[PDB]
Design a protein that fits this description.
- Chain A: It is found in: Cytoplasm, Cytoskeleton; Cytoplasm, Cell cortex; Cytoplasmic vesicle, Secretory vesicle, Cortical granule; Cell membrane.
- This is part of a larger assembly, with 5 copies of chain A.
- Chain A has 98 residues and is mainly α.
- Chain A contains 4 helices and 4 strands, in the order H-E-E-H-H-E-E-H.
- The first copy, chain A, has helices at 2-5, 26-35, 39-47, 64-94, and strands at residues 12-13, 20-21, 50-52, 57-59.
- In chain A, the strands form 2 sheets. Chain A has a two-stranded antiparallel ribbon with strand order 1-2. In chain A, strands 3-4 form a two-stranded antiparallel sheet.
- In chain A, 20% of the residues are buried.
- The interface between C and D is large, with 51 and 40 residues.
- Strand 7 of chain C pairs parallel with strand 3 of chain D, so a sheet runs across the interface.
- The complex binds adenosine-5'-diphosphate.
- Residues 122-124, 126-127, 176-182 of chain C line the site of adenosine-5'-diphosphate.
Chain lengths: 98, 49, 196, 281, 49
């Protein structure tokens, strides 16, 4: 359900600069409640990923297309991890006799 | 210059003859490929048969 | 009654093949295969040759069409009609293999052997060739003892693994939508029902 | 095996060899292949989609299994003449799929999520990549290199066993039952090698048993044939084959195994069981 | 004269390359003819057998 909700965040383009903005964070709140995480931290990481440029940390900027691509990659990685966990659980259940 | 140009005509004429012979000689092995492949195809099918 | 009805899509009545007179008539008629634009390969009678070619007539329509000698292929006698093993065909060629595959598919036989690997054709319909009775029938049966079936290949692989003590691998190759998933499903079902 | 065992046999060239395309795809050394070029361009200094396509066209341009997409690049960038047919590929978003970048902040947040399932899913985060403007404990492997390692381990395992190939054919692309497409079936039997796979079994010797294994498994057929005592394994099988009255064109004696045509062991197995039938009962 | 001689050298080089190509192409026909005769010779006894 969380993977399904991911992507509904309609990012808007700022009129001043080229920065992503989430005017309606309902989908973000739903995804955070489903996956079990915070909403403010998730929004700050999606719109301002904290990464070091070589020395200290800096809040890098993200555009609408970049934010959409990041959301898609996150959903893909989540689905891949879920499939891997399911396969591992199936293998463990099948390899539990001798 | 006529001697050098004259020799160029022989070389050019020979080159043109080689081109005409090349296209003619090329068809010899090219057309032979059809008969060669035909014989091979008939021989391959004959070998299998 | 389920097994009796499923046997129709497995065994082939060989009583309608034993006929030396029919084979002699076919040999005297001299029939061969030829390329087609709507049926892969169609039958045709061989006539007098003309150089590197020979005129032939289509058994369906009967039109005298010229066909190259390289495109003609020999036809198998009536004895090799819906054979159980493709390796037993006398005139082995593309046309004969295609005709045998078509005859086996239209007759309700998607499985067909071929030397050491079996061939399968997607029927696109749930066939009655999958049941507990059929699985029990194929239990402990050689490859040349039952009609072509994935259960037969699975049993042969299991027997080889138990005898030679060497591992096996039921590999399935084919284009998307050929039936590899169903073949693997049936192999796993047979292994779980037999090797339990 | 025929050449190693030393037997009368001629080399038959079937022509089926997809080594060129497999090399063009995976071959890392020598001329960089498709996967090798994508891995080399996996970095993000100046490479893009158009630059990667140009590099591929400049490198693997003269390869026989490489052509342009129709007249113009309307819906594809290049083609690869595979064993089945020509496929039109589009080099769009390929670098991202090969790198598979992920947000480090969101990854760490999911790893430390309150939910137990989400924490177990993202328990392994040391293999995530997400940098911008070479080894790293071998964790900087792309999706292409990771798939090659997984496939290499798979192909190496199947070679150690006895593969039982089961070829699957499709009648048509319309999902219609009972409608067989001869044009589509003919194209599959050619690339699949069904015809070439049957001639090798008929003309060759798919059956072969070791000298020692052939004795104990077939001595009941001709008990009074070998001298009751010690005898060489190779010479012992010669006396058994002679007693069985087998044609010379139905077996080939090598240096360690005894080959047989397609259908010889099937007859001996039935005769062997019939001989011991009175004992088993 | 020097420029005209250069054209003869270039023309002679072209005819020379054509002669080399003709020799290679002729060798193909000679080899194909020899191989073609082998298939024709191998098909005689093949059909007889
Ligand atoms: N041997 C078979 N018998 C009956 N139906 C089949 C068989 N093989 C495939 N099908 C049908 O074809 C459909 C698609 O099969 P698919 O899963 O694409 O096969 P694969 O995984 O080998 O491509 C399925 O819905 C299935 O019902």
């Amino acid at each position: 359900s969380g993977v399904l909700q991911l992507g509904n965040i309609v990012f808007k383009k700022e009129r001043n600069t080229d920065q992503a903005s989430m005017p309606d964070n309902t989908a973000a709140q739903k995804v955070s409640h489903l996956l079990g995480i915070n909403v403010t931290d998730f929004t700050r990481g999606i719109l301002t990923p904290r990464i070091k440029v070589g020395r200290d940390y800096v809040q890098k900027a993200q555009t609408k297309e970049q934010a959409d691509f990041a959301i898609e990659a996150l959903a893909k990685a989540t689905y891949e991890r879920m499939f891997r966990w399911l396969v591992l659980r199936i293998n463990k259940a099948l390899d539990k006799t001798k | 210059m006529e001697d050098s140009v004259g020799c160029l005509e022989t070389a050019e004429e020979v080159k043109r003859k080689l081109q005409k012979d090349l296209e003619g000689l090329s068809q010899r092995h090219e057309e032979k490929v059809a008969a060669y492949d035909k014989l091979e195809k008939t021989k391959t099918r004959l070998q299998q048969e | 009654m389920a097994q009796q009805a499923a046997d129709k899509y497995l065994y082939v009545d060989k009583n309608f093949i034993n006929n030396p007179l029919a084979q002699a008539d076919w040999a005297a008629k001299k029939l061969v295969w030829v390329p087609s634009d709507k049926s892969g390969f169609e039958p045709a009678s061989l006539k007098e040759e003309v150089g590197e070619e020979a005129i032939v007539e289509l058994v369906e329509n009967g039109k005298k069409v010229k066909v190259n000698k390289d495109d003609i292929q020999k036809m198998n006698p009536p004895k090799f009609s819906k054979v159980e093993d493709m390796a037993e065909l006398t005139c082995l060629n593309e046309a004969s293999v295609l005709h045998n595959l078509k005859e086996r598919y239209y007759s309700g036989l998607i499985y067909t052997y071929s030397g050491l690997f079996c061939v399968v054709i997607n029927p696109y319909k749930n066939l009655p060739i999958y049941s507990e009775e059929i699985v029990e029938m194929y239990k402990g049966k050689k490859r040349h003892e039952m009609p072509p079936h994935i259960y037969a290949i699975t049993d042969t692989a299991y027997r080889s693994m138990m005898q030679d003590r060497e591992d096996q691998s039921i590999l399935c190759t084919g284009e998307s939508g050929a039936g590899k998933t169903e073949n693997t499903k049936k192999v796993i079902q047979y292994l779980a029902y037999v090797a339990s | 095996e025929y050449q190693r065992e030393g037997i009368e046999w001629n080399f038959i060239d079937f022509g089926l060899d997809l080594q060129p395309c497999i090399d063009l795809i995976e071959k890392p050394a020598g001329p960089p292949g498709i996967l090798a070029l994508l891995d080399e361009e996996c970095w993000f200094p100046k490479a893009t989609d158009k630059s990667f396509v140009e590099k591929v066209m400049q490198e693997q341009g003269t390869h026989p299994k490489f052509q342009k997409p129709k007249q113009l690049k309307d819906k594809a960038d290049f083609c690869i003449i595979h064993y089945a047919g020509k496929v039109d590929y589009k080099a769009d978003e390929w670098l991202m799929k090969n790198m598979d970048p992920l947000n480090d902040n969101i990854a760490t947040l999911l790893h430390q999520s309150s939910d137990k399932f989400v924490s177990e899913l993202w328990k392994d985060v040391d293999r995530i990549i997400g940098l911008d403007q070479k080894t790293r404990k071998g964790m900087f492997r792309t999706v292409g290199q990771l798939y090659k390692e997984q496939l290499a381990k798979l192909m190496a395992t199947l070679r150690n066993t006895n593969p039982n190939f089961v070829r699957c054919i499709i009648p048509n692309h319309e999902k219609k039952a009972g409608k067989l497409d001869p044009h589509l079936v003919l194209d599959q039997l050619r690339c699949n090698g069904v015809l070439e796979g049957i001639r090798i079994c008929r003309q060759g010797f798919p059956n072969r048993v070791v000298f020692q294994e052939f004795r104990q498994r077939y001595e009941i057929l001709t008990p009074n044939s070998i001298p009751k005592g010690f005898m060489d394994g190779k010479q012992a099988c010669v006396l058994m084959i002679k007693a069985l009255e087998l044609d010379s064109n139905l077996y080939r004696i090598g240096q360690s195994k005894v080959f047989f045509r397609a259908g010889v062991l099937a007859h001996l197995e039935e005769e062997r069981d019939l001989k011991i039938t009175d004992v088993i009962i």
